[PDB]
Amino acid sequence: SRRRVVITGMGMLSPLGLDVPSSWEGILAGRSGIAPIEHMDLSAYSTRFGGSVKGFNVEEYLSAKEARKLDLFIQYGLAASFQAVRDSGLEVTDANRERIGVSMGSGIGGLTNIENNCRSLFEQGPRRISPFFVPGSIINMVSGFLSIHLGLQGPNYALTTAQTTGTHSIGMAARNIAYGEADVMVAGGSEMAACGLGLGGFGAARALSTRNDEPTRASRPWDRDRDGFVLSDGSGALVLEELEHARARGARIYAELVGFGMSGDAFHMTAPPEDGAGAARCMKNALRDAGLDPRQVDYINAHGTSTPAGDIAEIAAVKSVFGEHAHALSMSSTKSMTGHLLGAAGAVEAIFSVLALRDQVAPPTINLDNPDEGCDLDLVAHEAKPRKIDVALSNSFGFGGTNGTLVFRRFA
Amino acid sequence: SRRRVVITGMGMLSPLGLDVPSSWEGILAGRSGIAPIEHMDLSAYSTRFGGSVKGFNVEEYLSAKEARKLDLFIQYGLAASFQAVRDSGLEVTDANRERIGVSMGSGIGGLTNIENNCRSLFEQGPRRISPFFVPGSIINMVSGFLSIHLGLQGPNYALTTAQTTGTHSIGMAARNIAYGEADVMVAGGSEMAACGLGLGGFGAARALSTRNDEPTRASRPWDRDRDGFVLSDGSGALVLEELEHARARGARIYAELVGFGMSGDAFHMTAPPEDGAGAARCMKNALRDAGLDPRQVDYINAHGTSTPAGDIAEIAAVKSVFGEHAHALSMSSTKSMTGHLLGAAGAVEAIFSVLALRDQVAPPTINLDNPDEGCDLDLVAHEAKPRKIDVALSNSFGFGGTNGTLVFRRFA
Ligand SMILES: CCn1cc(NC(=O)C2CCC2)cn1
Structure with missing residues (x-):
């Protein structure tokens, strides 16, 4: 047999907005979040646009000093995760902290940080590499930092299955609850791959749209004039919760995860x-x-x-x-x-x-x-x-x- | 209801050998795999030694055409996976291919490839980034490539949990089999982080032994004169198999995974x-x-x-x-x-x-x-x-x- 799993909290950064309701309002209005990428010289690049997160303020979540230790993909995953946990109303206690875990993943992880630390290494040598280079760049640090910040002692892991990461993260977190390994999981994914390496890497594979002239028309699924994907940044996190656990505390349930x-x-x-x-x-x-x-x-x-x-x-x-x-x-x-x-x-x-x-x-x-x-x-x-x-x-x-x-x- | 899981195949590249038996003979003989690193100039680094894989022949496993596309960590993970599948004696067929999956992970993934492509980007521009940059560097491509070349259509994923990755990968793959999501999994991990960013970034954290003048004595767990970990490269893979599936085909069983x-x-x-x-x-x-x-x-x-x-x-x-x-x-x-x-x-x-x-x-x-x-x-x-x-x-x-x-x- 198997326990039921419901969604009690959601969190998001996207090219459409800095939270779920703003993102969703954009989605239902048919608004594009795609635009030429700013504060980055893409002259030499065949693609010059994408979905950037606009106006993100990490200091709503972290001190400047803790934010300096972390790649943008980790900042984005923590923002979505903190939103989701707040949205759920869950109270972490000594009585439940061993039953609350995290599975936040990434497909590509810390390219921006790798790129900036490459700059230091090549110009000046290894003694300029940041001491936080490794823990601030590795994909499991959203799960890591979230568990430390909120005192979560349940299953702590991270998936990396490229473009499938967020789906697998949520599914395997649902299994953890269904099979009694946890009562709550925070699950999802985050990504910030708009560096030269991201745009250059996908560009070298000719995988990206090159519709530089009309970036909002570039992403056109099933349209006969489509010419590849559009690279975008952000994060999604869900609070997954065993049904009886959610009912006992009077949680607002969005939907059930059945399969x-x-x-x-x-x-x-x-x-x-x-x-x-x-x-x-x-x-x-x-x-x-x-x-x-x-x-x-x-x-x-x-x-x-x-x-x-x-x-x-x-x-x-x-x-x-x-x-x-x-x-x-x-x-x-x-x-x-x-x-x-x-x-x-x-x-x-x-x-x-x-x-x-x-x-x-x-x-x-x-x-x-x-x-x-x-x-x-x-x-x-x-x-x-x-x-x-x-x-x-x-x-x-x-x-x-x-x-x-x-x-x-x-x-x- | 929860099925039993046994180990029927194992595969390895380590600093002590290019397979399991050669590595294990080194283990039982007390032999060190640690030596000054030869593949790059580390004079400016505080640590200049580690556990390298010595004399790895990728052409025992992969066509030169496939191999050139892949970071070393992927080549190592494929070598261990292939060894483990051969050791298991399992035959992949239309009847069982949907029931055989893979979960090979990495803590850092393709840092050498990403470093080398960052060097090309900064010196020569984005048009010199490899077309294989993304698929040849991202962590899930041991699972991906193994599935393509053996025809495994079961659960296909990858974990990234830093120094816990291999253990989590094997455990979660056992749960897949226990819960009936697969009958066979190839699971483990691979790593080759011995690049400037790797040795430089762990060095920046003062996490590494700096015993450059006596590398074989550097790794000294619980010794009062220990001064940090020694960075090492390689791969392990196990074929996990449901007990009755293994019994049914007359498999050799090494041991049972119980916990x-x-x-x-x-x-x-x-x-x-x-x-x-x-x-x-x-x-x-x-x-x-x-x-x-x-x-x-x-x-x-x-x-x-x-x-x-x-x-x-x-x-x-x-x-x-x-x-x-x-x-x-x-x-x-x-x-x-x-x-x-x-x-x-x-x-x-x-x-x-x-x-x-x-x-x-x-x-x-x-x-x-x-x-x-x-x-x-x-x-x-x-x-x-x-x-x-x-x-x-x-x-x-x-x-x-x-x-x-x-x-x-x-x-x-
Ligand atoms: C894909 C080709 N392939 C090569 C192997 N080799 C081995 O298993 C032996 C080398 C050490 C044990 C397995 N598959």
């Missing part, structure tokens, strides 16, 4: 199979885990990265899994607005999936001006669609053919 | 608490998970980093958990010989713990010339000790106060 699927494509290092066999296996695994028929799914938050092969693989996967229900569900890519937060994508998209349930509205896929060949599903083109949503899926597909699917259900 | 614990110190970003409270909580969780009397523990493969505070915290934790039985068990640090493989430490030490069970011998803590105040347990000083071992425990502790413990026992 989690994982699969490997075993296909290609960076490309998904054109038929989306791996994504179909992963969604079937998640629905089986939830004890739900494909027909019960109402809303899918796609991975929908705006890459040629990825977007078409997801259409094929949804048609394969859902058959005669494939057109009845609504599927949208919020990456059309936020761009691709890499390891944080799954985290912010799980939050948008939960709010789709709260508000009974499918967020839009903006920029979907000319659907590509066979992209004929309800992709919620251009504008939000109020509709019935009892069951919402959130899919992530990443490098190494790593797949994750979360299934959320309305709670009443 | 896994995790805990967070919630104390300090890098420092372990002096009393080892988090390590004690972690071990108690693992022993309760294994349904054991603590008196059943015969051998402990310590974390044993050769740091002043870490080594004494572990003594305090073992005394607190085992009481009078702390005086009857044997505890040793194989890091005395291998140095600290960081995210791979828990993986090679899990293999050493299984071989302690196979061969009924406690590996030595070499260099333990003068045990420090309170270090009065059986620490197997200097020479391997043949003894009865029914139950072996492997401990890891890392930055962020993250703790893992694995419990293995003989299988008959």
Whole structure:
């Protein structure tokens, strides 16, 4: 047997806003957070734009001195985590601190810090490298710093599954609670890969949109004129909680997390199979885990990265899994607005999936001006669609053919 | 309901050998793998030695075409994974490929590749960053590449929990099998952090031994003259398999994985608490998970980093958990010989713990010339000790106060 898991707290930094409600207001208005990247010379680069977090004040969370020790991706993950825990109303005590853990991940981790410490090393030598270089750059330090700050003594770990990180982080945290290893987990992901290395690295692979002239139109999932993904920064964190634990303290419950699927494509290092066999296996695994028929799914938050092969693989996967229900569900890519937060994508998209349930509205896929060949599903083109949503899926597909699917259900 | 998990295959690169048997012969003979580093000029560094993998031939494992794309930490993790899968005798088929997954992690990942690409970026511009920069550096690509080349379609993920990574990776992979999410997992870790940023960043924290003039004596866990950890490179991988699956195919079973614990110190970003409270909580969780009397523990493969505070915290934790039985068990640090493989430490030490069970011998803590105040347990000083071992425990502790413990026992 298995315990039930609900969402009692959410937190976010995104290109749309410095918290959940501002981000979500942008999402339902079809607003783009994409813009040319500032305070950075990108002349030599084929991509000059992305989704930056705008106006982030780390001193709302940390002293300047503790903030100086940490890469931006860690600052962003801590901000989302602190928001989520505050939003949950949870009181940590000696009676429960061993039952409260953290799993906040990242796909790429501390590139900005690595870049700045490379500058020191090359020019001046190793004696200029910061003493906090390692602990301030390693991916497990969101989980680490959060546990130390809040006194959390439960399971403490971090996933790194590239663009699947946030989805796997939340799913494996839900398993920890379901199987009695924890009663509460803070789970999600964070990313800040807008350094030369991030834009240069994805740029060297020709993976990014190069629509420098119209950055807000660059992320156009399933549109025939798409030319790759848009790199974005930020963080998402959820408070996952055992149902009886949440009820006993009178928690506000957003939604129930009923299913989690994982699969490997075993296909290609960076490309998904054109038929989306791996994504179909992963969604079937998640629905089986939830004890739900494909027909019960109402809303899918796609991975929908705006890459040629990825977007078409997801259409094929949804048609394969859902058959005669494939057109009845609504599927949208919020990456059309936020761009691709890499390891944080799954985290912010799980939050948008939960709010789709709260508000009974499918967020839009903006920029979907000319659907590509066979992209004929309800992709919620251009504008939000109020509709019935009892069951919402959130899919992530990443490098190494790593797949994750979360299934959320309305709670009443 | 919870299934039993056995070890059917093991694989390793270490500073003592290019496979498990060669490494283990070095362990039982008290041999040091530590020597001045040859691959780069460290005259400006305060530490100029570590545990290198000597004479690694990537063309035993990978085409020159695949190998050139991948950071050394990925090559090492693939070498160990391939060894472990071959050692297991498992045949991958259409009938079982969806039930076989991988969880190979790293603490730091592709720091050499990222450094070298940062050098190209700063000197030559973004168009000289490798197209393989991202997939060839990010931590999840051991799991990814292994899945692509063996056709593993089970759970595909990667942990990054600093010096706890290998232990967490193996434990969580065992839970996947226990709970029915997979029947087989390849799990462990790999590390190659011996670049300027690695040695420079740990050096900036004054965390490394600076015994440059006697490298083989630098790693001296619980010795009063210890002055920090020794940085080492390599990989460990285990094939974990559900018991009845292993029995059904007539697998050779090395041992059973009976217990896994995790805990967070919630104390300090890098420092372990002096009393080892988090390590004690972690071990108690693992022993309760294994349904054991603590008196059943015969051998402990310590974390044993050769740091002043870490080594004494572990003594305090073992005394607190085992009481009078702390005086009857044997505890040793194989890091005395291998140095600290960081995210791979828990993986090679899990293999050493299984071989302690196979061969009924406690590996030595070499260099333990003068045990420090309170270090009065059986620490197997200097020479391997043949003894009865029914139950072996492997401990890891890392930055962020993250703790893992694995419990293995003989299988008959
Ligand atoms: C992918 C090719 N491959 C090569 C190995 N080699 C070994 O297992 C031996 C070398 C030490 C033990 C396994 N797979």
